[PDB]
Amino acid sequence: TSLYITAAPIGAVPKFLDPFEATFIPSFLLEGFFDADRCASIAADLKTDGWEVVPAGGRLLQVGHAQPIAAHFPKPWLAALSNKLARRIVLQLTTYGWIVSEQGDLLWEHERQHHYLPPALIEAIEKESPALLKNMEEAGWIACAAGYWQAGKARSPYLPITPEAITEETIRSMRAGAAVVHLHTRDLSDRRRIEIPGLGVVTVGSQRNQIVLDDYDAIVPMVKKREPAAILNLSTSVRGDRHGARSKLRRAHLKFYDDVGSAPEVASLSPAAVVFQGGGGYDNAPDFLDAQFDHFERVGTRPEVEVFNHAIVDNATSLYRDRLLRTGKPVLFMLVAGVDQYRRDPITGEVEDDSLIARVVREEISSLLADESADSHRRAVELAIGQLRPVVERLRASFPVSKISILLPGPMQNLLVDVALGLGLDGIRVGLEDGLTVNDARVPGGVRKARGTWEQVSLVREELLGRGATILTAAQVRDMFGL
Numbered sequence: 001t002s003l004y005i006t007a008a009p010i011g012a013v014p015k016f017l018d019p020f021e022a023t024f025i026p027s028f029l030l031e032g033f034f035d036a037d038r039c040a041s042i043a044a045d046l047k048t049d050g051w052e053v054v055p056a057g058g059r060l061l062q063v064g065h066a067q068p069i070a071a072h073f074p075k076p077w078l079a080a081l082s083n084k085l086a087r088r089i090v091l092q093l094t095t096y097g098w099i100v101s102e103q104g105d106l107l108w109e110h111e112r113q114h115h116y117l118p119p120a121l122i123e124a125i126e127k128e129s130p131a132l133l134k135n136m137e138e139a140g141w142i143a144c145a146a147g148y149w150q151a152g153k154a155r156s157p158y159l160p161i162t163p164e165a166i167t168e169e170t171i172r173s174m175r176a177g178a179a180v181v182h183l184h185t186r187d188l189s190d191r192r193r194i195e196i197p198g199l200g201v202v203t204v205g206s207q208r209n210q211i212v213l214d215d216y217d218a219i220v221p222m223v224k225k226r227e228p229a230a231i232l233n234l235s236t237s238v239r240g241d242r243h244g245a246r247s248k249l250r251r252a253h254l255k256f257y258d259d260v261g262s263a264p265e266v267a268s269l270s271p272a273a274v275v276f277q278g279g280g281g282y283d284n285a286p287d288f289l290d291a292q293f294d295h296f297e298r299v300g301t302r303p304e305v306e307v308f309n310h311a312i313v314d315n316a317t318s319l320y321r322d323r324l325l326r327t328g329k330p331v332l333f334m335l336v337a338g339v340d341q342y343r344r345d346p347i348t349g350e351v352e353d354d355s356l357i358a359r360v361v362r363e364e365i366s367s368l369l370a371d372e373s374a375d376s377h378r379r380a381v382e383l384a385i386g387q388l389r390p391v392v393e394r395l396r397a398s399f400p401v402s403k404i405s406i407l408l409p410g411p412m413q414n415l416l417v418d419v420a421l422g423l424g425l426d427g428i429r430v431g432l433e434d435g436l437t438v439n440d441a442r443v444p445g446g447v448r449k450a451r452g453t454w455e456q457v458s459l460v461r462e463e464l465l466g467r468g469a470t471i472l473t474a475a476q477v478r479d480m481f482g483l
């Protein structure tokens, strides 16, 4: 039993959160120091960036954020709470860059901070433990009036979005055990600093998923200089930018890199429209795909078939089969399990479920994971394997020389190892692209923000080794895939 781990550090969806910026803007400073039109302008800019309106009742911990006009949260405090509340608090504070100590306490290890918790969280605390709320207030958590909150929804203070940060995370993820690194770039050109009197500076920006050629011209040679073994897997997705679905840009990063003596080893390829139930998908038309295949074959790049849906299973195993065989064996597949998908009827325009794990069953799996019992967990595993099994069998039957991996969205990654071994898969993918958390038994609630994709790689490797599995390295993977 040999598996290879894929690291996916960036992706399309999550965003970077600067743990040192303000996370609360009181309405009084905003309305107080701007004309109604520029006040409405900033407020609109903040909402776009994910800031949300909150009433009075929040608590703010501010230290050293002086704009004139305890960094501890101990385990016994979290232990006073239900597991759900403790988890909300731990996730919120680790999103803000607090860490879990070896004793299971939360700790902020810097001298300045501006960290806010919403009225709904505080009300929940007041109801479970008035003594805790008093303890927080004694530690310097102060009552707030209405204003604006940066939740950090799908955010992480460890998300790499620049060539330097991405190179570094790629290197750490490889040294932690990953053989393949799947990459995205982000467009950071719309970043503005908004200055608010009494508060300081808040930076806004979309961090939009986008193929950025200059970023790759930097990242690709930078990675290969330090870790020439790296098997780079470049995203060709235009999620977010659905107008670019036919564009040459979706293969322009897949070139021979002079500094490196090679084209990227791997690139994603989805042989059908990808229509997220959550919204924001992108087309992959037959004429576009023909051009992608011609190009991969020319520059020596192996497609990774992204199995988002049944349309793709069907297309890959019939029409595109010979093209996939031509681009090199083994043929590579990634099961995008747990992400709900539509298929659209082109004649009527109606959509129907086309997910690998049927939405109803995925919904059932998600509720089982929230019972958080071993019994429920077994059930969840059963259900996932049951949905995915025929897909895996179909792929195996059509491509006897193939490697299949699996990913799962954050709150489902507890299933990864069991499902992958249960299905006989060849590899597992983890990373901030898919999930932002790790389990940590030391802390109440047992869940916190991952310190990076490297950490998730390290945990999955560890769990795999204790199942007796063997982990392949990048050199082994490269040799055994002929890439």
Ligand SMILES: CC(C)(COP(=O)(O)OP(=O)(O)OC[C@H]1O[C@@H](n2cnc3c(N)ncnc32)[C@H](O)[C@@H]1OP(=O)(O)O)[C@@H](O)C(=O)NCCC(=O)NCCS[C@](C)(O)CC(=O)O
Pocket: 013, 014, 087, 091, 153, 154, 155, 234, 235, 236, 237, 268, 269, 306, 334, 336, 339, 407, 408, 409, 410, 411, 432, 433, 434, 435, 436, 437, 447
């Ligand atoms: C967006 C992202 C990556 C966020 O991940 P996250 O870990 O935050 O999970 P999420 O479900 O969004 O969390 C929502 C709320 O639940 C809480 N929470 C998270 N984990 C929890 C846990 N273990 N226990 C209890 N609670 C947990 C969070 O705190 C959060 O709280 P709120 O409800 O108050 O906000 C994730 O959501 C996502 O979208 N994953 C899917 C990624 C994906 O689509 N990957 C496919 C890529 S395909 C490919 C290969 O890249 C193709 C190509 O590139 O061309």
Ligand SMILES: O=C([O-])C(=O)[O-]
Pocket: 011, 012, 209, 235, 237, 238, 239, 274
């Ligand atoms: O990576 C993804 O989920 C995408 O952009 O298709």
Ligand SMILES: [Co+2]
Pocket: 008, 011, 012, 182, 183, 184, 235, 237, 433
């Ligand atoms: Co991706």
